[PDB]
């Protein structure tokens, strides 16, 4: 109850916080989706631009 | 009372610049009728 | 309060008849019942053994665990929604993605 | 005896919720999309009817599982049983 | 072993201030030594 | 019940003798709402957005940006603004540039009312980009 | 010395349950700077005091059977 | 008298079995997907983080983000070993108060040594509040740092006291039950009194919050 | 001689719950002075009622904590 | 006696917690009406509550301390 | 008994840092409500609740020090 | 005998600085709320801060002094 001594469950503690950060670790962010829509858009860009440059 | 009193300013010396902030954010359909109101023509003439 | 404890008892009235309706379901299982009473017992020996003590409050945490069964046929929508919600992107990725491809061609 | 345990969890995961998807799989994630949730059913009553999105039945077995293992430390301290059978 | 590699990036980050158990530890060892004093005096 | 609101720019007018049971106002000191029988007040306005809720299923989100709310005596409101736009005339993209430029003349500003009057700017700019 | 024991520990525990009529008074007594700003009056206005007014004396209800726990 | 409640003796044990499968076990409980769409049980554990980790981001705006990503598996853990245990017979790691001395100290003393290691000086220059007065310097720095040192203990101690606060209830109210062999009409008010504190109970995810953000307060106030 | 010992430090501790049985009479009183004010009660006016609810009983039942152990 | 003494020793000192079980319901009832009248939380106007409970129940357990370290 | 009195004196001594608990629940909640109608914080209206929470301190562990003056 | 009636009341006086703890947050407190509005600080705001800070504690010292009256 009031229980004592202590030797016990905080080494027993750490070894947990190898498990958490591997699972939650492999989550996924469903705002870096709308991130990799944006550089497409202005490489294709870039190059009809290189493509203009090909022209002009 | 604000930053705007305490400093020397009135209301309508308020009014005027958070007015003109939102003719500034309109796009280029809505700018005319912010260049319809303007009234900037009055003049100024006191005797000395 | 007077028009709220009717408000019970009319569902005193009505809880006394919907049991009453579900007994007519058991009356169904006159006959063709023989799952429960082969396991009826376990639970008969094994509450002749040990298993009373202070836990009326086993009950009541796996009470308001049965209420939350309820709110979970609409969490089908909201996992459900999740899950439709994350499909339209994708596809509005692959069109956008073959419209800007195909025109600069 | 580790590729023992190891195999419990992976049968006991893949059939009764919620067997994922990630093709080589594709197939064996609509598996689990009519699920075995009809035959985890039969053991309540019927009631716990809402578990074809949030499926109660996947989850609430592990967790019935876990009480009546710690059932079975509790009974030294709390015998109280006298010379007989209860009602 | 790779409950190492998978997390080794995060650990020399942050354990730099946040693997200071050492105050734990002796916040912890000086905690043994009077419960093991007060049941020798009993 | 048995209110009148009335809505008007120095140009137009969005509501003549028309209420519907609840006005949202952004006022100068605070905020409040309109229950159809408030306690009257006499209170001027800030920047910031009026949704008034009409009865007609939905609300009606307009954003004034100085004017005068007078509730009286009689269950009756008369809301008159200067500049009250709605939503979709406005452009959130300029509104995102027009922020950081007026902060960046804030320390370059050496007298105390000049100083004063760019205080003045930027709070209109910052509750012009949360409306939207 | 039991008669003696018992009272002293009842008395002193029903202390307590006067210590959430101050609250109470805040509850009941701030219904009034709302309803004079605004007249909308069986909305929820109302019934949040009734949120207020049983939860208040929830903690006032709470003590005494811990006094009765101890005349016993 | 009318209604005589009852009472019985019985010691209240806080036992110490086998704990090193107890803290394991709600690990177990949040599986992880290698696919791209997952299968409607994780898919609502993926959702529930992405909540809370957009309010320990929003606050900080740093180069001391990278702190955060540990902070949402600090409020998992703790989230569940406290809801666990409201089962019939199930045992709580955090009502002993013997880990929770090590989930402050680890954590408070890695908040002071991160200011330490960067600024060196206006860290705890921070104890500077204002455009400093003469009468009350030795007043101060006397007080403000006597309310530094109470924050590890203030922090751990407010965890372990009222999770086993809630704990007692349980039994208390529940064990009156047992012994009310009197007039049965109490019986079900001592029950239904029941039935709401163990809905109050899941406040024990609410204390949840109040450690892992007055953890946030304690570090983005000195970093 | 300390049995009326376990019932004095018992009933001097159950009345440090009295604060708490005001300090919650406090923010619901507090609550409709902000609501009536202001009409948007499923916003976050309504989630600060709670958390302030669960704060401030969370120091309200752990001084009961210190209660029983005096007892038991 | 040493014994008897302690456990009304450590019933007084429970009561230190009820300065701070009440003074953090007036500082979350006071951002209820700071939040209703201004909609600018995310800035100091909820940091500054936290803020205010972090040096408040700082004295909460302050006194239960002392009531510990006068039983054991 | 002269150490009993010892004990039981430094039991009420610390209830007077109670005090301190809910005076100060409010001076930090009267910085949320009179922030927001006026930001200008790094004036001296920060300045004056560091003077009120200090101030207001001085009298919290003055009433602490008593019961350390009173066992020793 | 004579130190245990001496012990005890020396402590059981000094709770009532408590009440002065609580009567002078309101001071720092509502001058936070009363400078707000109106900027006129080096005007009679402060002059009516000291006289208010500078009253209360003169209910709690009188019984202060009284309190040390008891022990000698």
């Known amino acids: 109850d009031t229980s004592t001594w202590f030797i016990t469950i905080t080494s027993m503690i750490m070894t947990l916080f190898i498990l958490f950060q591997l699972k939650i670790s492999n989550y996924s962010y469903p705002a870096s989706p709308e991130s990799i829509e944006l550089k497409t858009q202005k490489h294709s860009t870039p190059?009809?631009?290189?493509?203009?440059?090909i022209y002009l | 009372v604000a930053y705007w009193r305490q400093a020397g300013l009135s209301y309508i010396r308020y009014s005027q610049i958070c007015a003109k902030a939102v003719r500034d954010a309109l796009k280029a359909e809505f700018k005319a009728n912010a260049e319809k109101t303007s009234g900037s023509n009055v003049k100024i003439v006191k005797v000395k | 309060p007077p028009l709220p404890e009717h408000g019970g008892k009319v569902r005193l009235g009505l809880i006394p008849e919907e049991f009453f309706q579900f007994l007519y379901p058991k009356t169904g299982v006159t006959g063709p019942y023989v799952?429960?009473?082969?396991?009826?017992?376990?639970?008969?020996?094994?509450?002749?053994?040990?298993?009373?003590?202070?836990?009326?409050?086993?009950?009541?945490?796996?009470?308001?665990?049965?209420?939350?069964?309820?709110?979970?046929?609409?969490?089908?929508?909201?996992?459900?929604?999740?899950?439709?919600?994350?499909?339209?992107?994708?596809?509005?990725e692959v069109k956008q993605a073959s419209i800007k491809q195909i025109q600069d061609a | 005896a580790s590729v023992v345990p190891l195999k419990d969890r992976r049968l006991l995961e893949v059939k009764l919720g919620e067997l994922p998807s990630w093709i080589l799989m594709r197939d064996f994630t609509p598996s689990?999309?009519?699920?075995?949730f009809q035959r985890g059913y039969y053991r309540y009553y019927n009631k716990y009817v809402n578990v074809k999105k949030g499926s109660v039945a996947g989850l609430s077995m592990v967790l019935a599982a876990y009480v009546v293992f710690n059932y079975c430390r509790s009974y030294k301290e709390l015998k109280h049983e006298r010379l007989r059978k209860y009602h | 072993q790779f409950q190492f590699t998978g997390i080794k990036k995060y650990f020399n980050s942050y354990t730099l201030t946040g693997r200071m158990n050492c105050v734990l530890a002796t916040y912890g060892g000086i905690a043994l030594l009077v419960l093991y004093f007060k049941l020798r005096s009993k | 019940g048995q209110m009148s609101f009335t809505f008007a720019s120095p140009t137009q007018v969005f509501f003549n003798g028309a209420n519907v049971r609840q006005v949202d106002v952004p006022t100068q000191t605070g905020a409040f709402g309109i229950l159809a029988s408030h306690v009257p007040t006499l209170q001027v306005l800030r920047p910031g957005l009026v949704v008034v809720h009409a009865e007609d299923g939905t609300t009606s989100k307009y954003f004034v940006s100085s004017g005068s709310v007078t509730v009286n005596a009689d269950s009756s409101v008369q809301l008159l603004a200067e500049e009250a736009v709605t939503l979709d005339m406005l452009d959130p993209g300029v509104a995102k540039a027009n922020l950081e430029k007026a902060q960046s003349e804030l320390l370059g500003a050496a007298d105390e009312a000049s100083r004063a009057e760019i205080q003045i700017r930027i709070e209109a700019n910052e509750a012009l980009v949360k409306a939207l | 010395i039991d008669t003696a024991a018992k009272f002293i520990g009842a008395g002193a525990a029903t202390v307590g349950v006067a210590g959430s009529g101050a609250g109470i008074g805040t509850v009941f007594g701030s219904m009034i700077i709302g309803y004079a700003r605004n007249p909308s009056l069986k909305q929820q206005?109302?019934?949040?005091?009734?949120?207020?007014?049983?939860?208040?004396?929830?903690?006032?209800?709470?003590?005494?059977?811990?006094?009765?726990?101890?005349?016993? | 008298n009318e209604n005589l409640f009852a009472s019985f003796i019985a010691p209240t044990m806080m036992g110490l079995p086998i704990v090193t499968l107890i803290i394991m076990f709600p690990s177990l409980l949040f599986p992880t997907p290698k696919r791209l769409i997952n299968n409607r049980t994780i898919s609502i554990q993926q959702w529930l983080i992405q909540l809370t980790s957009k309010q320990m981001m929003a606050i900080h705006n740093?180069?001391?983000?990278?702190?955060?990503?540990?902070?949402?598996?600090?409020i998992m853990f703790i989230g569940s070993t406290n809801i666990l245990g409201l089962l019939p017979?199930?045992?709580?790691?955090?009502?002993?108060?013997?880990?929770?001395?090590?989930?402050a100290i680890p954590l408070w003393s890695a908040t002071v040594f991160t200011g330490f290691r960067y600024k060196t000086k206006t860290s705890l220059a921070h104890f500077l509040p204002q455009g400093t007065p003469a009468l009350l310097i030795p007043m101060l720095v006397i007080i403000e740092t006597i309310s530094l040192f109470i924050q590890p203990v203030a922090l751990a101690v407010r965890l372990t006291a009222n999770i086993t606060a809630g704990h007692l209830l349980i039994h208390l109210i529940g064990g009156a039950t047992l012994a009310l062999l009197n007039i049965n009409t109490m019986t079900a008010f001592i029950t239904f009194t029941i039935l709401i504190l163990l809905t109050i109970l899941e406040f024990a995810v609410a204390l949840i919050q109040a450690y892992v953000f007055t953890l946030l307060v304690s570090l983005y106030l000195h970093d």
Do not use: R
């Open chain 7, 45 to 72: 206005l109302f019934s949040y005091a009734i949120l207020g007014f049983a939860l208040s004396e929830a903690m006032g209800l709470f003590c005494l059977m811990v006094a009765f726990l101890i005349l016993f």
């Open chain 3, 35 to 92: 799952l429960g009473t082969g396991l009826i017992l376990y639970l008969l020996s094994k509450e002749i053994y040990v298993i009373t003590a202070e836990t009326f409050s086993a009950i009541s945490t796996i009470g308001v665990l049965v209420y939350i069964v309820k709110k979970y046929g609409a969490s089908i929508g909201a996992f459900a929604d999740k899950l439709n919600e994350q499909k339209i992107a994708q596809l509005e």
């Open chain 4, 32 to 36: 689990g999309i009519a699920g075995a």
């Open chain 8, 62 to 74: 740093q180069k001391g983000q990278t702190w955060s990503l540990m902070l949402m598996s600090l």
């Open chain 8, 89 to 103: 017979h199930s045992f709580t790691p955090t009502t002993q108060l013997s880990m929770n001395l090590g989930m």
């Open chain 1, 47 to 53: 190059w009809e631009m290189k493509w203009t440059k």
